[PDB]
Amino acid sequence: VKNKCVNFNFNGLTGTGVLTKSNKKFLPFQQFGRDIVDTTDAVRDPQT
Amino acid sequence: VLHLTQDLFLPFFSNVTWFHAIDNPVLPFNDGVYFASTEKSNIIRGWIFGTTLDSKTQSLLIVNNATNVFIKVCEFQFCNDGVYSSANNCTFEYVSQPFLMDLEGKQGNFKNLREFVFKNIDGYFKIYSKHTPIIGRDFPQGFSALEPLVDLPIGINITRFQTLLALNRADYYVGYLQPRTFLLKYNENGTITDAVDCALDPLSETKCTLKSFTVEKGIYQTSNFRVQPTESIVRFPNVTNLCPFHEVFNATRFASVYAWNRTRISNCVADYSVLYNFAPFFAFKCYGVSPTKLNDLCFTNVYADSFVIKGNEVSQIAPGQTGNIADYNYKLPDDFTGCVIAWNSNKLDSKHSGNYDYWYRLFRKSKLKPFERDISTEIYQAGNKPCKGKGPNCYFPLQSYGFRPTYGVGHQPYRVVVLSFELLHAPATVCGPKKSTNLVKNKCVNFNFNGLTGTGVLTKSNKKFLPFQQFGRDIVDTTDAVRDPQTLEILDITPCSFGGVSVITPGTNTSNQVAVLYQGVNCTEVSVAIHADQLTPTWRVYSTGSNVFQTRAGCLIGAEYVNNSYECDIPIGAGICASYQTQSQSIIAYTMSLGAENSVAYSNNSIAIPTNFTISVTTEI
Amino acid sequence: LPVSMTKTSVDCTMYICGDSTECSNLLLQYGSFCTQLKRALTGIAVEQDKNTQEVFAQVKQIYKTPPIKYFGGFNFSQILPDPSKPSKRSPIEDLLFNKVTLADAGFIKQYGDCLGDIAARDLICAQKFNGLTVLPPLLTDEMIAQYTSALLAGTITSGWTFGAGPALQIPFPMQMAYRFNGIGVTQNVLYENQKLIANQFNSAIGKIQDSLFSTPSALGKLQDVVNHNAQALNTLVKQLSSKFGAISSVLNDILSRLDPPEAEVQIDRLITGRLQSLQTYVTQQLIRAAEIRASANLAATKMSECVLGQSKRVDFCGKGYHLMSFPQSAPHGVVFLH
Amino acid sequence: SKFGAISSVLNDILSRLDPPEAEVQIDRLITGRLQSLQTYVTQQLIRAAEIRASANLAATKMSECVLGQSKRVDFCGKGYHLMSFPQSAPHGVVFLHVTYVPAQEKNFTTAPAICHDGKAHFPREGVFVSNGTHWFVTQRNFYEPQIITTDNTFVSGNCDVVIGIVNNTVYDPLQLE
Amino acid sequence: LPVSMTKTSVDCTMYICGDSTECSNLLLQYGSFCTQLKRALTGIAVEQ
Ligand SMILES: *[C@@H]1O[C@H](CO)[C@@H](O[C@@H]2O[C@H](CO)[C@@H](O)[C@H](O)[C@@H]2O)[C@H](O)[C@H]1NC(C)=O
Ligand SMILES: *[C@@H]1O[C@H](CO)[C@@H](O[C@@H]2O[C@H](CO)[C@@H](O)[C@H](O)[C@@H]2O)[C@H](O)[C@H]1NC(C)=O
Ligand SMILES: *[C@@H]1O[C@H](CO)[C@@H](O[C@@H]2O[C@H](CO)[C@@H](O)[C@H](O)[C@@H]2O)[C@H](O)[C@H]1NC(C)=O
Ligand SMILES: *[C@@H]1O[C@H](CO)[C@@H](O[C@@H]2O[C@H](CO)[C@@H](O)[C@H](O)[C@@H]2O)[C@H](O)[C@H]1NC(C)=O
Ligand SMILES: *[C@@H]1O[C@H](CO)[C@@H](O[C@@H]2O[C@H](CO)[C@@H](O)[C@H](O)[C@@H]2O)[C@H](O)[C@H]1NC(C)=O
Ligand SMILES: *[C@@H]1O[C@H](CO)[C@@H](O[C@@H]2O[C@H](CO)[C@@H](O)[C@H](O)[C@@H]2O)[C@H](O)[C@H]1NC(C)=O
Ligand SMILES: *[C@@H]1O[C@H](CO)[C@@H](O)[C@H](O)[C@H]1NC(C)=O
Ligand SMILES: *[C@@H]1O[C@H](CO)[C@@H](O)[C@H](O)[C@H]1NC(C)=O
Ligand SMILES: *[C@@H]1O[C@H](CO)[C@@H](O)[C@H](O)[C@H]1NC(C)=O
Ligand SMILES: *[C@@H]1O[C@H](CO)[C@@H](O)[C@H](O)[C@H]1NC(C)=O
Ligand SMILES: *[C@@H]1O[C@H](CO)[C@@H](O)[C@H](O)[C@H]1NC(C)=O
Ligand SMILES: *[C@@H]1O[C@H](CO)[C@@H](O)[C@H](O)[C@H]1NC(C)=O
Ligand SMILES: *[C@@H]1O[C@H](CO)[C@@H](O)[C@H](O)[C@H]1NC(C)=O
Ligand SMILES: *[C@@H]1O[C@H](CO)[C@@H](O)[C@H](O)[C@H]1NC(C)=O
Ligand SMILES: *[C@@H]1O[C@H](CO)[C@@H](O)[C@H](O)[C@H]1NC(C)=O
Ligand SMILES: *[C@@H]1O[C@H](CO)[C@@H](O)[C@H](O)[C@H]1NC(C)=O
Ligand SMILES: *[C@@H]1O[C@H](CO)[C@@H](O)[C@H](O)[C@H]1NC(C)=O
């Protein structure tokens, strides 16, 4: 479910927040996301 | 983002060995290998890893073919040219898509350059690759990232490395990685556009402390510089008498725990290898010290308490425990610094028809204070009777440890010997078997003076040590002078060279040249350390004779002293400023000019009165 | 008035973990706690340099006194630079330098004689043993004297005009007449008792030198600043001989006396003690730097008002109806003669 | 930052460790982040004190330079302060100090007083200056020579105590009429 | 305009270890952490 506050457990990455579509340019080996201050940003959907 | 990483990377402007082919040397493998090749279609298939490459140790093999890869872990025998002749105890077979991709624009000039990086951190074999269609002809420097392909945990020992060839009827670029800190510039789309090393150039070390690819004009403090010691002197005392650990482990009547025999071991050299030969141990639990690190220490005194106790009571003996032995028979103090030794002896505390020689105390009026003996035979009181005798409510304090050759291990005679050290500041009377090397003065050396470890420079002194004085110190309690145990002479101790390096650079958009300021250190010291190559700085800035300048703030390397005077541009310290000036361009250091040299025309009756005026608008923020 | 404090550039890496790799690896687990400390102390040093710049660098052109020195009777040899002295400093300016003792000059390059210390090494060698260094100021105390000489030669040969624009020469009798006219007394008073007022000025200047010669300490503010800095440095060095509840207070001891799996517990304790000790030093240094910056801004305003002109605010430039002011350079500060 | 804990993610060490044992790691994370948030708060307090000092300076500068003319030298810009115009900037203020600065000057001559007839004449407000042959009275910050009259000068003295007194004739607009 | 604040002379020994000998013994292992606090408070009082 997207555009709604949900607790996610993406591949063992626990947390809380809101998810949606992206236009990111993940390289095929890329799996996680982060920012300049090292906080998990975007998770590649393991089943999509 | 300008993310900074510390990992195994190929150093910038490093040595890469370029080979040819027309036999196939076995390259060493350590900390990973960077591999690159430039080929027409295919002459290199795969690689071989492992140790001794024979049928006695496991090894890897990663040959590619037309369609797949052939990764495996095995114990191959040899081929000397079908690349193996043995797959005996060999598993971990693996197959996936091929590593080699080749494309041509209807012509062979597109000599694609294939770059690979392998490493073996905590097993988990990591392989990275990237095929750049270059123009591999001359291995260009155009930045190029590398994407992982497969990560598989071989979990083996890799030291040697080899490669395979192909058939037919300029390649082999090999580089070695090292643990370095890198600063990587990430594109908006997530690729890596540029990267800068952090241990290569003064400008690079600054560009990676301001985590930025642009360093504005100014002076930036990056790190410090230290002179790593050349030699390591270890000066232990003048004694060679081996300690009597033999006669504390060769004894025949290790007393009962109620009377814990306490020998004293002093004036001796303690090699605990003789401690490791008289006893096939069952418990070497050391608390204050690590048993491996026991031959490099000096103890003021050593106590060897020996007593035979039962199996569970071995686990009983420890700092801060409980039980009938740890409370009424032998109590090890909480802040214990030493080792306990327990080995099995049912050959000297046993016989047919039995034996009951040993003894222990289950009945004491209170607990036993640490390291206290309580040899006494007083009947323990029960109720309110002052009774002096055995029987009910009238119990003898100490009962038997009757030892026989046949009980379970939980009930057997272990000859427990515990060693107590005094690892404090005092003359050391017991030291390890470490040899006493020579003495070198006026040079940065690691010293191990009588168990006092440290680093610094030593020399003769004119101190007035009293004959009982052994150590030295200062007003803030830092060890200053150590009396040589084998010369009875006084040697002072210095810091290594500790200072601070500041890099003086103009804007990176102006020039890549830099000046290096070593803070508050004579430049002869930094010059001799550099020429001896014992400086912690691995970025070595040039020294042409016109780039050295002993400032009151240190010494400047990379900037020449001009005798002119200009307005201060980059503040260095102590009246010296540096700036980027034309010659055709270089960095110059000068003494700041405080302003225009002006003299007033004061006189008894002369006056200057303005005949005009101006209106100036200044700004304040 | 204090103008600057000692510039320190402490290193967490060597101060907390002297030449140790395991301790450095453990300290890396605390994040960027010490980049903050280095940045704070670098900012403090830059701010002290800026404070000195604000207080003294008020005149662009460096002025010089005339070759002859007859300022209508006023005797200025006591504050003018002395050519005979190699340092080119005023007689009153020498007492301030001889009555203040700096524990660490900084511009010594003392390395090479901690070995040659022979006797028990001092505070400086002991601090160098634990990564605790002091930077030297950007402005030497020889060109600060040149700034002061220019400031004083611009106010006795050009009045206050050099503080606004071009330095316009004016005879000192007429400058005194103007300063008198600025406080509500007509100029004729000065020209009718010029000799008497010159004698009074000379006596006042002469009796201020002995008042600093024989007093125990009137520079006690600058000495207080120096003592506070040296004493904070000393109480920061002395925290490296504290166990903090660890087995021993020596990194090279507990490293060689325990295996890495167990030595981490003690090294963590020592790191969490020395970091909390180096964060007290940095915090007190920041507070003292703010106080010194306030004092230095006050000193810069006092220079710009009292020295570069006549100030109509009462009890700012000394007690009484202010006429003029002379700056004098003192160790880590300035001295005003109102 | 792990701060010597198993992991730096609370949602990780909570889902990986049971409450009895995870307390040890959570305590470490708390004692790290609290000491990290007490450094931020302390440095923010220090910076706020510094900013308050600067803002009080700015308020005083506004109230003096803007709402009036300041006789303090080098406070409202360099030179003789005339005006100041405020401008608002992000998280601060910008002042436009309009100042009067002198210009081209000439060596003329000067005397403390002028002795016409036994009496020393002093300028009411200005300098006795001399082209070279004809003594003139003028202002201090601008050259505007005027004929030395009894209105320009006030008279008190005996022509024997003023050092540097020059001989010249002062004028009175009374004897002629 | 405020001119002064309350002058305090907080003592570490009694504040941290009320009439305790073992606690004082453990506190002595922290070095001159509290001489600094007493000096700072004394300086504050003298400054007020
Ligand atoms: C990141 O990726 C985007 C998606 O491919 C790129 O946008 C494209 O740009 C090309 C021109 O290069 C267009 O033809 C295409 O329609 C699309 O807009 C974008 O440039 C890229 N950014 C980079 C590489 O910096
Ligand atoms: C503990 O047991 C040791 C070995 O039996 C004793 O050491 C030796 O004891 C013999 C006498 O039995 C001495 O002749 C010899 O020199 C050596 O000391 C040790 O004395 C003993 N200690 C106690 C306190 O009983
Ligand atoms: C005072 O200074 C003014 C400028 O600072 C002079 O004005 C100048 O006038 C000339 C023409 O004569 C212009 O070309 C120039 O741009 C400027 O406006 C002014 O003349 C001068 N007055 C005296 C008396 O020197
Ligand atoms: C200005 O004041 C000076 C005080 O330092 C006078 O110097 C004096 O010189 C005499 C020797 O001639 C010394 O004995 C005395 O101690 C002092 O140094 C100087 O003469 C004086 N000059 C004028 C013109 O007043
Ligand atoms: C003194 O000041 C005088 C101004 O009144 C100048 O004298 C002028 O001289 C001309 C003739 O040369 C007269 O016509 C005029 O009325 C005026 O008196 C004179 O130049 C000046 N002296 C110097 C040396 O500048
Ligand atoms: C200014 O003019 C006075 C008379 O107008 C001069 O007084 C004269 O002084 C001389 C001696 O110097 C006497 O001989 C004469 O009788 C008269 O008193 C005065 O000197 C003069 N001053 C200057 C500086 O020229
Ligand atoms: C997940 O598995 C299902 C079942 O085989 C398959 O239909 C689907 O395509 C898979 N999706 C992904 C992303 O692997
Ligand atoms: C690479 O090897 C060559 C040949 O010995 C040598 O001249 C060069 O200095 C080496 N590269 C570096 C960076 O030292
Ligand atoms: C290449 O290796 C794969 C590995 O399974 C094998 O199946 C194949 O027969 C080999 N040869 C070719 C031409 O693909
Ligand atoms: C595999 O290892 C065992 C280890 O004892 C050995 O006995 C056996 O011979 C090995 N198999 C081979 C070499 O084929
Ligand atoms: C790996 O091989 C090297 C070289 O023989 C050897 O020194 C090292 O001890 C080996 N390590 C292991 C874990 O086998
Ligand atoms: C005791 O000493 C004898 C002496 O010959 C020796 O043979 C024996 O191995 C020693 N045993 C122990 C346990 O020290
Ligand atoms: C050390 O021992 C040797 C050998 O007995 C002796 O010659 C030398 O004098 C001794 N030196 C000291 C300082 O004890
Ligand atoms: C430092 O300065 C020079 C240059 O090295 C030399 O005299 C000596 O090494 C040192 N001198 C002093 C006085 O410390
Ligand atoms: C020029 O510089 C040299 C040193 O580079 C110095 O010895 C000399 O005195 C200088 N000359 C002048 C005129 O400053
Ligand atoms: C000023 O007057 C004094 C004393 O009359 C004299 O010594 C000095 O040379 C004079 N200077 C000038 C510039 O006239
Ligand atoms: C006044 O005359 C002196 C003597 O040469 C000269 O140095 C000075 O610059 C002159 N001042 C002026 C013209 O304003």
Residue numbers in the entry:
A (entry chain C): 534 to 581
B (entry chain B): 47 to 68, 80 to 138, 158 to 210, 212 to 246, 263 to 482, 484 to 677, 689 to 726
C (entry chain A): 727 to 1064
D (entry chain B): 968 to 1144
E (entry chain C): 727 to 774
Give verbatim excerpts from the published study on this entry.
The dense glycan shield consisting of 22–23 N-glycosylation sequons per protomer is an essential feature of SARS-CoV-2 S architecture. The glycans have been shown to play intrinsic and extrinsic roles in protein folding, modulating conformational activation and immune evasion. The transition to the ‘up’ state exposures of RBD for the binding to hACE2 is also a prerequisite for S-mediated viral fusion, directly correlating with infectivity. Here, we dissected the role of N354-linked glycosylation, acquired by BA.2.86 sub-lineages, as a RBD conformational control element in attenuating viral infectivity.
